[PDB]
Design goal:
This is part of a larger assembly, with 2 copies of chain A (57 residues). By secondary structure, chain A is mostly helical. Chain A is built from 1 helix and no strands. Chains A and B meet through α1 of A and α1 of B.
Chain lengths: 57, 57
């Protein structure tokens, strides 16, 4: 029981940690997703501003 | 023993899956970091092209 309980608390700690590796990686990708959405939106707005500047050109 | 063994196979599988999720979340952090950087670089390029188009304008 202790071998499984220990393996379990460790699987659970590893799980909480891995969940946090994922949660933090998720927070980071989410931060990045917000950045890609904002930057890519600016890429497109800059590209649109550019298209506008070029069309105006 | 089974409550813990079962909780363990599940905590352990959840760990492999949380670790996988972390792997994928991190793969996505890295793939997005690459993409965010690509949109930031392309944005800087759109902005440089915009400054250029605007100067040409």
């Amino acid at each position: 029981l202790d071998k499984y309980s220990e393996a379990l608390k460790d699987a659970q700690e590893k799980l909480e940690l891995a969940e946090k590796k994922a949660t933090d990686a998720e927070a980071d990708v989410a931060s990045l997703n917000r950045r890609i959405q904002l930057v890519e939106e600016e890429l497109d707005r800059a590209q649109e501003r550019l298209a506008t500047a070029l069309q105006k050109l």
